[PDB]
Amino acid sequence: AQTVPYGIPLIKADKVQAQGFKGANVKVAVLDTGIQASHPDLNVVGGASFVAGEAYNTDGNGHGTHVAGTVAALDNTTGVLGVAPSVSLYAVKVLNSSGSGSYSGIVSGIEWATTNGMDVINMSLGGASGSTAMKQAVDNAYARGVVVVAAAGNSGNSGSTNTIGYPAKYDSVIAVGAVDSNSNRASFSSVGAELEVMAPGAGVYSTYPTNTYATLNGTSMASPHVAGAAALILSKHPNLSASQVRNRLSSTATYLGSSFYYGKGLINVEAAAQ
Numbered sequence: 001a002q003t004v005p006y007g008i009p010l011i012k013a014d015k016v017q018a019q020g021f022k023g024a025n026v027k028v029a030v031l032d033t034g035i036q037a038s039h040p041d042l043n044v045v046g047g048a049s050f051v052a053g054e055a056y057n058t059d060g061n062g063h064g065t066h067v068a069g070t071v072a073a074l075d076n077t078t079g080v081l082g083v084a085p086s087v088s089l090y091a092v093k094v095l096n097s098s099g100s101g102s103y104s105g106i107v108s109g110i111e112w113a114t115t116n117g118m119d120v121i122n123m124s125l126g127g128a129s130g131s132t133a134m135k136q137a138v139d140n141a142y143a144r145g146v147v148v149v150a151a152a153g154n155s156g157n158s159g160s161t162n163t164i165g166y167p168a169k170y171d172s173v174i175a176v177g178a179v180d181s182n183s184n185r186a187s188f189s190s191v192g193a194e195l196e197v198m199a200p201g202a203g204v205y206s207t208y209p210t211n212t213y214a215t216l217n218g219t220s221m222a223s224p225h226v227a228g229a230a231a232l233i234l235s236k237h238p239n240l241s242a243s244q245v246r247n248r249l250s251s252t253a254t255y256l257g258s259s260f261y262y263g264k265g266l267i268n269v270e271a272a273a274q
């Protein structure tokens with residue numbers, strides 16, 4: 001009745017969940033295209049909208065509900081299952097239905113999450129260039145205790161070329177890369193020195209607008225696995241700092257190969273949340 005997306009077992013989320021740690025009472029904001037809050041496998045407690053004309057609890061694109069689903073789709077007898085199924089989900093709409101947003105929508109969205117007490121911030125969005133506003137934004141959210149996790153990018157490797165982008169490029173934000181189910185890197189996964197960890201990314205099946213589920217590809221999909229894993233780490237050890245969580249994710253990761261392609265490795269929430 002309920003589907004267990006290959007990702008959950010691949011990062012050992014099921015192990016920690018069996019320990020009784022499901023991300024409960026941990027606040028998680030998803031800066032995206034909105035969230036089809038009425039979806040039966042999702043529980044959006046609240047959020048804000050920084051895109052004109054669109055509320056925060058609707059997903060005109062689909063990307064948002066998908067990424068929310070990876071982090072916290074309700075542990076029940078329907079749909080899929082999320083990495084941290086008991087987390088407090090927050091929809092922070094910063095991308096419109098085309099999957100585009102402005103530096104100010106995004107900056108406003110981060111500023112809100114930091115103000116409102118979010119523990120983890122997930123950003124499955126990016127761009128070629130950053131901004132002083134965005135950099136200072138993520139720097140504060142991080143310094144204030146938030147775990148900012150961002151997609152690395154989907155530009156492959158152009159040789160020496162660092163295809164990693166903002167917000168992921170910055171050092172207060174964890175840049176996540178995508179591996180398939182065989183634990184191999186994905187052709188689209190951006191490469192660069194600031195690549196931190198690898199989380200499932202190809203063939204990711206999750207919640208999709210209009211009460212259904214779809215399969216997507218992208219580091220957009222890798223990202224919520226880590227935003228998710230940070231939540232299980234925080235529920236189990238709520239006294240940890242963002243740097244302490246970040247370190248556990250990266251330090252216990254399973255080595256796959258060169259960091260310019262894999263960062264420290266594929267993540268392991270069981271060893272991390274140890």
Ligand code: NA
Binds near residue numbers: 074075077
């Ligand atoms: Na479910």
Ligand code: NA
Binds near residue numbers: 171173
């Ligand atoms: Na980074």
